[PDB]
Every structure is written in C-alpha cells, then in structure tokens.
A paper describes a structure:
Cytochrome P450 enzymes (P450s) are a superfamily of monooxygenases that utilize a cysteine thiolate–ligated heme moiety to perform a wide range of demanding oxidative transformations. Within GPA biosynthesis, P450s function in a specific, stepwise manner to install the essential side-chain crosslinks in the core peptide in a process that typically requires one Oxy enzyme per crosslink to be installed. Given the apparent preference for the unusual heme orientation shown by OxyA enzymes, we investigated the OxyA homolog from kistamicin biosynthesis (OxyAkis), which is an atypical GPA. Structural and biochemical analysis of OxyAkis has shown that this P450 enzyme is highly prone to oxidation and can display an atypical heme orientation in different protein batches.
Author numbering: 6 to 66, 74 to 162, 181 to 384
Amino acid sequence: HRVLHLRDRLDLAAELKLLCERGPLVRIPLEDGSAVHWFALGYDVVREVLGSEKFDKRVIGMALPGNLLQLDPPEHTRLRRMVAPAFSVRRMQALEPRVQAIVDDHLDTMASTGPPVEFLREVAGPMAARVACEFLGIPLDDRGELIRLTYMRELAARLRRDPGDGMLGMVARDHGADISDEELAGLCAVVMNSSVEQTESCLAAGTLLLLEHPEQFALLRERPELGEQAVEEIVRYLSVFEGLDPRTATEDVEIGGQVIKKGEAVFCSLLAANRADPALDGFDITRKESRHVAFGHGIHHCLGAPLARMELRIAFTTLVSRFPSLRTAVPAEEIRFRPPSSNVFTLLELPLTW
Ligand code: HEM
C-alpha cells in the first residue's frame, strides 16, 4: 500500500491528499479477491482502531523474541508491564542531565570540527545512539562496538548475569528469571533500532524543519520553555513513523460508522491522520496542544515516548541556542528524502553550515 507513503518533501503528495478526500476510513478490497483491506486515515478513526480490543497483530498474506509489537494480550501485557517502569517520570528526570551532557558532547564535537557537517551521520545518528546506550545501561566498553554494528545474545546474557544500571539492569534485577537472554537481547535491539531509526530521523529532519521556519528556530532560542510544544509539533509534522502494521479484526466491529468484518485488515496511516487536515496543519511551535498520533495509541503506544520526547526537547533547544547562525549548506529544495517505503521516513543526508 505504497500510496500511504507518498510525500512532497515533508508534505503529503497530491495523490495521497486525493485519497484522503475519500473519507477517514476507506475500504480497499484487493484486486484478486484474496482479502478486504481498510485504510484508516483520520485522527479519530485511527484512535478508534488502535484503542479497540477487537483487533490483533496477526501476520497476514522476522519474528524476534522480546518484540512487543509482535505480541497481543496477555503475553504483550506480561512483557510490557516488566519494562514499563524504565520510563516513569521519576526515571526520565534522573536521566535528563546525563542526556543533556551527551547532547552537549556531540554539539561540542560539531563546533570543533567546524562547518560544514553532514548532520545526519556525524551528529544526529551518534547522539541518538549514545543516548540509547545510556538509557539501556550498556557497559562503556561495549558501546563503541554496539553502535558500530547499528553479539546481542552474548551481550544480553552477560549483562543479565551481572545487572548494571539503566533499563536492562532494572529488568534483569527485578525480573531476572522471567525474561530470557533472547528476550532481553530483543528489547535491546528494538531500543537501539528505535533510536538510530525513528529518533535520529526526528533529530535530522526536525532540524531541517526548524531551519525552514527561521522565525520559529529563533523563537525556540528566545523562549526555550516552548521546547515541549515544539517537540509535539515536530513529531506531528514529520510523522517519521508513517504507517502501522495491520490490525486484523478478530470479530465484526463497527468503526467510523462502517462494519469491519472479522478477518479484515486495517492499515493506520499516522502520516495522513497527522497532516491531512488542511485547517491547522501549518508548522507552529506556539501551538499549546498538538493533535497527533505520531506515537500511536492504545496498548502498543510507543513505549519509548517519554525518552524520545525528553531527548528531542533537549536536542532542539540546545541546538538552536548554541548555533543561532545554523543554516543548510545547500538550498533546502535539494535535500534528498528516502523514496516511499514502509521503512522509517528520513532524509539521506543534511549538510549544514554556520
Ligand atoms: C521520535 C521517535 C519515535 C517515534 C515517532 C516512535 C513511534 C512509535 C509508534 C507509532 C509506535 C506504535 C507502533 C504500532 O502501534 O504499530 C511505537 C512503538 C514502540 N516504540 Fe516507539 N517511536 C519512537 C521512539 C522510540 C524510542 C526512543 C523507543 C525506546 C525504547 C521506542 C520503543 C518502542 C517500542 C518498544 C514500541 C512497541 C510497544 C508495544 O508494542 O507495546 N520508540 N513507536
């Protein structure tokens, strides 16, 4: 369903805009009669689908342990409840100064190398990866290699036998016998993946978005208290996680005024839900409350959202303050974005100068 990923730079492609005009829930019977699929395109219907207990995440026509996105209740609940305490408000507050210092480290490297910089590979990527290591509690001597590769079972088993700090230590200390080596390794892999894919892309493309709106780049500098609002507006506008794994109805269920039959698959487009409403779509960090589903909704709602929200706030606020003269080293119109795919949305490189 490639149409759900068609963009014009950061905005929706006309072809996808045209599709959204067909209403927030669109029935898509396959041309071969093999199935009936649905596109959930509106904010309310996407929330209705994702909150419903009447859908599962069955495979339809690689499964890895510790991957919450491939579990349904009650197994999903069992694993999620064991890892959830790593993201409490208490734990992000304890972690904030150390994340601030990691961000400052990478912006120190940037200011010393001097311009230009390829911001994606040289700043955003490493920053996101290093924050992930700190959150996870990766031992210092493993971080360089772990990041270079993005082994995991060997790493997870060793840390499990001697709990450290961070999320992995907490999990092994409090649930050592209830989580296997492969499941702990799977958690580690998802966190690294979500950091070097989703978070890195938000950092790089969000910097571009701010640079394309220099009034707001500067506003965040003069009013850093806007950081939290800025993050919500950035993740809404970017929608780097564009479309979700299908939800299959386990029984007939009425959604958005239509009957989704047992066995039919619903594809939620976060991109469309976040962007298709022309009314209030303009990028504006002074919006006090953003209407978006950039982190999903329901039992699979992004487990890392507290970390992502804190890391992005720290990164963007510090960046605009330390580099008021930042600008793209090429015209914004020349930036390459990855072509339509179910993979995370990202630009391919971001040359910056200052
Ligand atoms: C800007 C960055 C991020 C965005 C936009 C994002 C987005 C999302 C979305 C939309 C989902 C729901 C997928 C679905 O329901 O099919 C999700 C799930 C998840 N995310 Fe994030 N994510 C981000 C960063 C992170 C980070 C930093 C972590 C670190 C732990 C993380 C861990 C997870 C996990 C484990 C799940 C699965 C939860 C479950 O199935 O119960 N993500 N993410």
